A paper describes a structure:
DARPins are engineered proteins that consist of 4–5 structurally similar repeats that stack on top of each other, forming a compact protein domain. DARPins combine all potential advantages of single domain binders over antibodies: they are small in size (ca. 18 kDa), possess high biophysical stability, have very high expression yields in E. coli, can easily be genetically encoded for in vivo applications and are devoid of disulphides and hence well suited for applications where they are expressed in the reducing cytoplasm. Structural investigations showed that these DARPins bind to different but slightly overlapping epitopes.
Surprisingly, SEC-MALS revealed that 3G124nc had a dimeric fraction of approximately one third, in contrast to the original 3G124, which was predominantly monomeric. 3G124nc did not show a clear transition up to 92 °C, a stability which is not unusual for full-length DARPins with three internal repeats and an optimized C-cap. Thermal denaturation of several GFP-clamps was assessed; they show a transition between 68.7 °C and 71.8 °C. This probably corresponds to the melting of the truncated DARPin domain, whereas 3G124nc remains folded in the investigated temperature range. All hydrogen bonds except two (GFP-residue Gln204 to Asp143 and His114 of eGFP) are also found in the complex structures of the parental DARPins with eGFP. The structures of the GFP-clamps confirm the intended design: both DARPin-derived domains overlay well with the parental DARPins when superimposed on eGFP. Most interactions between the DARPins and eGFP are found in the single DARPin complexes as well as in the GFP-clamp complexes, confirming that both domains can bind their respective epitope without strain or steric hindrance.
Residue numbers in the entry:
A (entry chain B): 3 to 64, 68 to 230
B (entry chain A): 13 to 169
Write the structure that this text describes.
C-alpha cells in the first residue's frame, strides 16, 4: 500500500545540516521524483555560502523510495512499504586515505511531499587532500547499491562504494555502510538480496549565482529473476 | 502573473483555461525558475489539446529545462504517442540529449514504448547514440528486458 503513494509525480524537499572538520554549513534541495521511471529532478543550494566540500561528496546523502522496482521485484521494495510513516536512514562513509562522514536521516511524507531531513558529521579530513582541497571533478559515476534484509531490526543493510573522479585522472573511493529501519510499527517488505543501479548527472544553472548543484538521476532495482 | 497561471492550467490539463490565458496575452514561452515551460508540462502529462494550442501560439518546441529535458524527452518517456508525433511534426529535435545524454530514443526504449521507438526511428532517431554512461538505446532495451524493442533497434542499424 505504501507503493500506491508513488504511482505519480511527488514533490521533494531536502534539508541538510552539515559539520565537516569544524566547518559548518547547510544545503537545501527542491524538485520532484517519479518512481515509475526511477527519476529525480532536483536542485541544491548551499544556504550558508561557499560549500566547504565538493558537491559530489554529498550526493548519496542528499531518497531511494523513488527507485524503480520492476513488477517481478515489488515484493522487495522496503523503502516504499515503509511509507507514509517513513524510515530512518543511517550511514558511515569512509573516504580512502582521508576523513569520514556519518549521517542520520528520516525519510517520510509531510503532507503530499516526501521529505528527507539530514544531519551530517564529518571528521579526520586532510586540509590539502582531495575533499577539503576540492580536487574532485564535477561529475558522478554509476554505481551498484547492494541491499540485504535485516530481520533483527526489521529493516535492511545496504553497502556500496562511490567512485569520485580526481582531476589528475586517479580515483577517490568512498566506502558506504548504511542501515534503514521503519519509523512506524506497521509491517514492511523485507527483501531477498538485490541491488540498485544508479545514474546521475551533475550540472550548473546558468542563472544561479549561489553555490549550487543541479541533479538528474535514474535508479532501477535489479539482480532477481 | 499570466505566466504562472498558464503553467498551472497546462499542468492540470485545463484546455479551456489555457486558451483564455493565451487570448489574454500570456507568454506562451513562460518558464519557472527551473526552466520548465507550459509545453513541458502538457507534453509530460499527455495533454494533447494543450500541446497543440501552445504550439499554435508559437511555443518553443525544443525548450530545455535545467536538467536538459525537452518536451519530446518527457512525452517519449511517458508513452504519449500522438504528442510525440505532433512535437516532431512541429520541429522537435529528435536527437536532443538530456543531462545524462539520453535521447528520446533512449527513454522510449527504456520505458518500453515500442510504437514511440518506431516513430522516433521514422523521424531519424540516431540508433547508435550513447548516453553519458556509454549506453545505447539497445543496451537500455536489454537491461529492461524489452526484447521486441531490442529487435527493432537491431534491424535499424
Amino acid at each position: 500500500k505504501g507503493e500506491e503513494l508513488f504511482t505519480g509525480v511527488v514533490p521533494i524537499l531536502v534539508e541538510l545540516d552539515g559539520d565537516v572538520n569544524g566547518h559548518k554549513f547547510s544545503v537545501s534541495g527542491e524538485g520532484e521524483g517519479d518512481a515509475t521511471y526511477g527519476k529525480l529532478t532536483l536542485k541544491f543550494i548551499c544556504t550558508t555560502g561557499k560549500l566547504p566540500v565538493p558537491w559530489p561528496t554529498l550526493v548519496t546523502t542528499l531518497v531511494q523510495c523513488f527507485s524503480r522496482y520492476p513488477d517481478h521485484m515489488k515484493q522487495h521494495d522496503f523503502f516504499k512499504s515503509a511509507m507514509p510513516e517513513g524510515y530512518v536512514q543511517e550511514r558511515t562513509i569512509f573516504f580512502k586515505d582521508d576523513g569520514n562522514y556519518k549521517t542520520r536521516a528520516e525519510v517520510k511524507f509531510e503532507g503530499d511531499t516526501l521529505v528527507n531531513r539530514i544531519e551530517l558529521k564529518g571528521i579526520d579530513f586532510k586540509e590539502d587532500g582531495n575533499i577539503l582541497g576540492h580536487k574532485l571533478e564535477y561529475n558522478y559515476n554509476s554505481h551498484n547499491v547492494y541491499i540485504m534484509a535485516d530481520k533483527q531490526k526489521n529493516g535492511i543493510k545496504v553497502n556500496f562504494k562511490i567512485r569520485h573522479n580526481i582531476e589528475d585522472g586517479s580515483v577517490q573511493l568512498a566506502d558506504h555502510y548504511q542501515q534503514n529501519t521503519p519509523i512506524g510499527d506497521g509491517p514492511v517488505l523485507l527483501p531477498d538480496n538485490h541491488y540498485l543501479s544508479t545514474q546521475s548527472a551533475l550540472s550548473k544553472d546558468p542563472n544561479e549565482k549561489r553555490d549550487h548543484m543541479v541533479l538528474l538521476e535514474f535508479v532501477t532495482a535489479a539482480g532477481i529473476t | 502573473d499570466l505566466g504562472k497561471k498558464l503553467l498551472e492550467a497546462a499542468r492540470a490539463g485545463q484546455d479551456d483555461e489555457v486558451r483564455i490565458l493565451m487570448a489574454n496575452g500570456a507568454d506562451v514561452n513562460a518558464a519557472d525558475d527551473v526552466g520548465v515551460t507550459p509545453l513541458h508540462l502538457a507534453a509530460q502529462r499527455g495533454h494533447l489539446e494543450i500541446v497543440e494550442v501552445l504550439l499554435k501560439y508559437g511555443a518553443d518546441v525544443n525548450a530545455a529545462d535545467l536538467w536538459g529535458q525537452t518536451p519530446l524527452h518527457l512525452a517519449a518517456t511517458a508513452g504519449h504517442l500522438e504528442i510525440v508525433e505532433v512535437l516532431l511534426k512541429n520541429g522537435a529535435d529528435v536527437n536532443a540529449r538530456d543531462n545524462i545524454g539520453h535521447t528520446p530514443l533512449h527513454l522510449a526504449a527504456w520505458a518500453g514504448h515500442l510504437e514511440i521507438v518506431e516513430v522516433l526511428l521514422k523521424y531519424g532517431a540516431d540508433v547508435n547514440a550513447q548516453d553519458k554512461f556509454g549506453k545505447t538505446p539497445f543496451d537500455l532495451a536489454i537491461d529492461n528486458g524489452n526484447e521486441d524493442i531490442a529487435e527493432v533497434l537491431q534491424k535499424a542499424a
